[PDB]
């Protein structure tokens, strides 16, 4: 929009949707002010009407403020470029007040603003010079003066209230007091009185009370502070009043006067009168005093934006370009941050401001782009505010709801896990138990030329150490009567088809469930108990703050009582096999994986093997309490991969001829490396042919070429829906 | 399916893509077999029950358009329906547009409803602009039509109202005939009369196809984006310049798109000799076409015109390239028979004073004013170019 | 989006869930019930194989088992449909709450949808469809 408002855009035609703009002459940093397009339009009219030879943009706006009201109008009658960036801002009243009202405003404002420019050249220029070390010290000297003036205004407002609460007033009475305040601010702009007299107080006793209030204000307004040579009334007269005299069309027009009544009512309904006075003084104390622009830049507080909403967020903005002189209707600031965004660019783009650079026309463009670049992100935060903040609180509410309904599910799991333990003690007393649960070493089927194949001499006796990726053969003794039936039929059996079918159906009559359980160290028991009470007090702080979440905890316990199927130290680490078929040899090879079914690496410590036995005949539909439970001896499980590698290589690469006896060293120690992990490791080599060790262990610690016996019988279509059907099993078995 | 490309010697740039409109596209030739069932379907008359239930205006335009030309003129003259004049412009046997203008005035003469004669015998300016643009398309096809067009203009200005629309259409008529000097001089007369150049004539001038009867009818649906681009470019050029610069830009683009490059450079010659201040877009376009053509089709006075227009409004690099290409083409063995570009003392002093006026504010002119003065004075030592390369490298 | 919700509603209407219930009053009555998406039952079967001692169960006890087997199977269908139509309706609320400016009732057209809502109410208030 800056390139498009000049003469150079005439030699270009553009696409309206996405206009790629040209390189202007002010885009080059070597451009002087004489080659500027917009300055030469201003330097031409300055010699014509202002009658001053102007060689710089600094010299132009300085000469614009030296001008006389007969020359200030004559320049602005022939000047049509009010805005260049086309951002809607409040304007001086030369772009308003058509007719005779333009002339009498110019005789009033330009004579008054010349007093304010004389007030900034020597009086305030030495005061910022005295406190130029740390900023903000000037307005903090006026801060305790204005606070005593504000206490008189609260007492005057409390006398009008006559004790009753402002919320309890009739809606007509709220607009009646707000009508007086906007007409009081109109008399502050026109008549130049800080506390003007209105005809509302006709009582003689109230006039005496108002006269004591008006004289105490004017004594405070004319009380000079020690470090600053100016009084606080002359600061308001030349910084605060002179800025609002420039925009007198906001106050004289009766339509915008009705906007300020509705804007003051929404300010007073949610905020008391004691808080709106403290924030006015904070807006003057926290601020910046500009010497070149000649304005006092306030804090733009949330009470300040509600006070001046009709100036910066209403439809009072009238833009004037070379193309069209337009009156902007339906202009609306959404939130109070837009008034803070609009007034930031409005005070920074004042003429002769410190934010604007005046050395080159290139530096004037880059200082003006950044003032609108920072304003755009402030408006980009505004349009993202009400839909993302409501999406953050809605995402917060689901995580608190998920924490509450999980805390209500844990007592349902404790009473269910206790009741299946009590029914197991009554079943194991009467049923056939398993006695010998002994882990043994795997024997090698390979034998020499002298050995006999029919003897089978060795079978292993005991295991004290089981590594991670190693197989061990477990021994079980189950005295179920189906086991002794198959031991006679298989030893009786050369072979027919009807006899082999009788062998297979007897194996599926019962099964065994073998699992691996890890002991809990009492230090880790104190670590586990420290976190589960850390969440328990965390949930209870959430419940007390949000009373709706206390109601949802009662819903979850009443719902889980309906959905859950009714039933009437060591810790589980790895399930080894789901279904162990009935064998005459009573021995199966069980491969431990590196990762469990949950998908994490296994820790070290004591591990015992838990074996449960089931029979489909006497126990239909596989109730978990009706089983034959036996325990194995404790052993030690850890990883030998840091051990056996360091004993072999005595590392980041593995050589070519070294890799083939390296896997045989792993098989000598008991680990099971398959042919698929060996062949696919040789596909990823370097330029020297070196096999990566991290590629080999990642294929070793994966579920690709070796699986547990539990996940071996399942389908990929079953394993894909496994976290989906488990969550359907958790809602029916809470905890 | 590989068809050659006509040599416009137009610059490939996203700025002058509106200048690239009017170029014929082989994409339309590839699109052509898709339109064949549509034009095969459109040749058939509607049924009687649809035509009898048709509205009044639709039935009048679809019956008068199918009717013979003189019968339609007879119906118009009988029932005084003057608003069907653009229909009979599109007739199957309509004559050349001067005969149609005489027939229009004859129909207004013998009409059944006679208004007051100040409003009865006044044709709308859209009709006169369409007639003169048909005449200019025919002068593009055959330049010796122009004389009769002059006679036609010699009646229309004496009978109708001299508007900027018909004056811009007559400028397009003079341009399409190859008449360079009087077209620019009519444009300068419009600029001195503060008459705006018509934007539809400015768009049709830079589209040297598309006879405007089927443009207002709209049988060519594509390239309307190009028409809108040229109309908006004409409005943008008129916001900051007069009518003569817009007309000279249109003349340059028209002679570039009709492969008449000698008249394309005669446009710049006559615009410098007459006093028309060219727009900066036209000067940049002329410099890039000079770069595309390598200064081959150029003369000494056209070189002087380009250097004057570049010293007035132009960059240092464009002026330096134009002067260096002129000095190199003087030294080429092909152009040794042709005379060399020599600056007379008055225009040389004018060019050097305008360069010094630009260089008092610009540093890029102040660094190369000595090289410009050496290139104009015909004494060019190569040590200046060596020092220029040394300062560019360092 | 409205065609996928209709696709999901029509799917769970024709599907099949199952639920069992065992009598808590000592009897070995087990009932298995198959329940469609309309709430109806496709098959109700009793299992007497668990209880050998009989002739002590009244007809009120057998209806209490079947009431529990229907309540378990209907809640089985309502939980299966809450995981089939679950994540689709969760992504629906993100598309609609944060995408009001893409729909016909957000932004400047929210005033029209509110005007048509109040105008639809007065046309039901003019008749006795609302005031009764």
């Amino acid at each position: 929009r800056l390139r498009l408002s000049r003469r150079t855009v005439a030699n270009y035609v553009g696409l309206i949707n996405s206009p790629e703009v040209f390189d202007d002459e002010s885009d080059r940093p070597e451009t002087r002010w004489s080659q500027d397009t917009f300055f030469r339009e201003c330097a031409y009219l300055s010699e014509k009407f202002l009658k001053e030879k102007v060689s710089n943009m600094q010299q132009f706006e300085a000469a614009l403020k030296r001008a006389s009201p007969e020359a200030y109008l004559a320049f602005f009658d022939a000047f049509q470029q009010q805005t260049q960036t086309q951002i809607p801002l409040p304007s001086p009243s030369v772009w308003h007040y058509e007719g005779e009202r333009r002339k009498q405003w110019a005789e009033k404002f330009i004579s008054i603003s010349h007093k304010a420019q004389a007030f900034f050249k020597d009086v305030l220029s030495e005061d910022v010079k005295k406190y130029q070390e740390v900023p903000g010290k000037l307005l903090q000297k006026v801060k305790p003066v204005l606070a005593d003036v504000g206490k008189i205004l609260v007492k005057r407002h409390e006398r009008w209230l006559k004790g009753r609460v402002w919320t309890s007033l009739t809606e007509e009475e709220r607009e009646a007091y707000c009508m007086k305040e906007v007409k009081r601010q109109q008399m502050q702009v026109e008549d130049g009185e800080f506390d003007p007299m209105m005809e509302d107080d006709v009582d003689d006793t109230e006039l005496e009370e108002w006269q004591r209030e008006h004289d105490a204000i004017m004594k405070l307004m004319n009380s000079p502070i020690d470090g600053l040579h100016f009084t606080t009334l002359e600061l308001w007269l030349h910084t605060m009043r002179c800025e609002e005299l420039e925009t007198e069309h906001i106050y004289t027009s009766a339509r915008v006067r009705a906007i300020q009544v509705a804007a003051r009512k929404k300010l007073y309904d949610t905020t008391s009168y004691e808080e709106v006075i403290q924030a006015v003084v904070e807006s003057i104390a926290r601020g910046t005093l500009d010497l070149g622009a000649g304005v006092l830049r306030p804090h733009f507080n949330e009470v300040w934006c509600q006070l001046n909403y009709a100036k910066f967020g209403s439809s009072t903005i009238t833009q004037h370009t070379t193309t069209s002189r337009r009156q902007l209707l339906f202009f609306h600031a959404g939130s109070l941050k837009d008034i803070a965004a609009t007034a930031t660019l409005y005070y920074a783009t004042k003429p002769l401001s410190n934010s604007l650079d005046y050395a080159s026309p290139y530096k004037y463009r880059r200082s003006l782009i950044t003032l609108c670049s920072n304003y755009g992100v402030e408006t980009a935060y505004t349009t993202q505010r009400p839909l993302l903040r409501s999406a953050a609180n809605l995402a917060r509410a689901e995580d608190l709801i998920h924490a509450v309904v999980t805390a209500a599910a844990q007592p349902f799991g404790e009473r269910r896990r206790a009741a299946t333990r009590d029914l197991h003690m009554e079943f194991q007393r009467l049923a056939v138990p398993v006695e010998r649960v002994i882990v043994a070493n795997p024997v090698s089927a390979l034998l020499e030329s002298g050995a006999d194949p029919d003897e089978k001499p060795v079978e292993g006796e005991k295991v004290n150490m089981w590594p991670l990726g190693a197989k061990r053969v477990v021994l079980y003794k189950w005295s179920a009567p189906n086991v002794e039936k198959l031991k006679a039929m298989e030893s009786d059996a050369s072979l027919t088809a009807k006899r082999l079918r009788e062998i297979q159906e007897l194996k599926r009559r019962g099964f065994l469930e073998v699992s691996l359980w890890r002991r809990v160290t009492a230090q880790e028991r104190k670590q586990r108990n420290e976190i589960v009470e850390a969440k328990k007090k965390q949930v209870e702080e959430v419940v007390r703050t949000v009373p709706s979440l206390a109601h949802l905890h009662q819903y979850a316990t009443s719902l889980y009582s309906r959905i859950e199927e009714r039933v009437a130290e060591w810790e589980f680490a790895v399930l080894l096999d789901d279904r162990v078929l009935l064998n005459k040899e009573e021995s199966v090879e069980l491969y431990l994986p590196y990762r469990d079914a949950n998908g994490e690496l296994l820790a070290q410590g004591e591990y015992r093997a838990l074996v449960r036995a089931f029979d489909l005949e006497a126990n239909p539909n596989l109730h978990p309490a009706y089983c034959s439970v036996g325990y194995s001896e404790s052993f030690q499980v850890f990883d030998a991969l840091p051990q056996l590698i360091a004993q072999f290589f005595r590392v980041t690469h593995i050589p070519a001829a070294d890799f083939t006896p390296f896997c045989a060293f792993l098989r000598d120690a008991g680990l099971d490396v398959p042919l698929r992990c060996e062949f696919e490791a040789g596909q990823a080599v370097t330029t020297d042919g070196d096999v990566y060790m991290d590629y080999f262990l990642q294929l070793l610690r994966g579920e690709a070429f070796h699986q547990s016996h539990a996940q071996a019988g399942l389908t990929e279509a079953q394993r894909a829906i496994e976290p989906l059907c488990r969550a359907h099993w958790v809602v029916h078995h809470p905890g | 399916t590989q068809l050659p490309d006509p040599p416009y010697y137009l610059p490939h740039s996203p700025r002058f893509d509106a200048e690239r409109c009017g170029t014929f596209n082989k994409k339309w030739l590839l699109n052509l077999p898709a339109l064949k069932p549509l034009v095969r379907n459109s040749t058939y008359l509607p049924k009687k029950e649809e035509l009898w239930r048709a509205p009044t205006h639709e039935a009048l335009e679809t019956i008068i358009g199918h009717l013979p030309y003189h019968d339609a003129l007879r119906y118009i003259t009988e029932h005084s329906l003057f608003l069907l004049f653009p229909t009979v412009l599109r007739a199957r046997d309509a004559p050349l547009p001067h005969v149609i203008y005489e027939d229009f005035m004859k129909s207004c003469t013998f009409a059944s409803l006679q208004n007051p004669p100040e409003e009865q015998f006044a044709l709308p300016s859209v009709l006169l602009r369409t007639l003169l643009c048909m005449a200019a398309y025919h002068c593009t096809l055959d330049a010796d039509y122009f004389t009769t067009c002059q006679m036609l203009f010699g009646r229309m200005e004496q009978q109708q109202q001299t508007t900027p629309e018909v004056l811009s259409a007559w400028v397009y008529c003079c341009t399409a005939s190859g008449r360079v000097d009087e077209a620019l001089t009519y444009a300068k007369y419009m600029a001195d009369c503060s008459a705006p150049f018509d934007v539809t004539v400015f768009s049709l001038m830079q589209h040297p196809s598309l006879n405007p009867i089927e443009v207002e009818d709209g049988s060519v649906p594509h390239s309307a984006k190009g028409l809108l681009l040229q109309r908006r470019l004409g409005n943008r050029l008129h916001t900051a310049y007069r009518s003569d610069a817009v007309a000279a830009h249109g003349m340059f683009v028209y002679y570039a798109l009709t492969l008449s490059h000698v008249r394309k450079w005669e446009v710049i010659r006559a615009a410098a000799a007459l006093g028309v201040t060219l727009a900066e877009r036209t000067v940049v376009l002329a410099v890039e076409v000079f770069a595309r053509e390598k200064g081959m089709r150029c003369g000494p006075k056209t070189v002087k015109a380009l250097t004057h227009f570049l010293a007035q409004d132009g960059t240092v690099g464009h002026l330096l390239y134009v002067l260096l290409r002129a000095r190199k083409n003087e030294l080429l063995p092909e152009f040794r028979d042709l005379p060399h570009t020599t600056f007379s003392e008055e225009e040389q002093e004018l060019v050097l004073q305008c360069v010094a006026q630009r260089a008092r504010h610009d540093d890029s002119f102040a660094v190369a004013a000595t090289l410009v003065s050496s290139l104009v004075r015909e004494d060019d030592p190569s040590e200046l170019l060596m020092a220029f390369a040394r300062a560019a490298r360092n | 989006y409205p065609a996928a919700v209709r696709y999901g509603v029509e799917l769970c209407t024709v599907l099949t869930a199952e639920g069992k219930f065992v009598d808590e009053r000592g009897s070995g009555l087990s009932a298995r019930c198959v329940v469609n998406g309309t709430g109806a039952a496709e098959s109700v079967v009793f299992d007497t194989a668990n209880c050998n001692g009989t002739n002590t169960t009244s007809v009120e006890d057998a209806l209490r088992v079947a009431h529990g087997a229907l309540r378990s199977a209907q809640d089985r269908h309502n939980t299966l449909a809450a995981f089939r139509l679950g994540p689709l309706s969760k992504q629906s609320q993100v598309l609609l709450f944060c995408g009001v400016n893409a729909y016909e009732f957000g932004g400047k057209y929210a005033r029209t949808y509110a005007y048509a809502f109040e105008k639809a109410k007065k046309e039901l208030e003019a008749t006795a469809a609302s005031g009764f």
Binding site: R1, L4, S5, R7, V9, A10, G14, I16, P19, R40, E41, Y44, Q80, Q81, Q86, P88, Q319, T321, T322, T323, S324, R326, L328, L329, F330, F331, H332, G334 | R232, N235, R236, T239, A240, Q357, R358, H361 | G107, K108
Partner: peptide
């Protein structure tokens, strides 16, 4: 809020489509 955005989209396209008359300067 939509009316304030669409009005600024309106007058930024009037500036793009149809440019107004350029004021006067003095040529060097």
């Amino acid at each position: 809020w939509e009316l304030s955005r669409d009005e600024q989209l309106f007058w930024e396209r009037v500036e793009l489509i149809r440019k107004g008359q350029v004021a006067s300067i003095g040529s060097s």
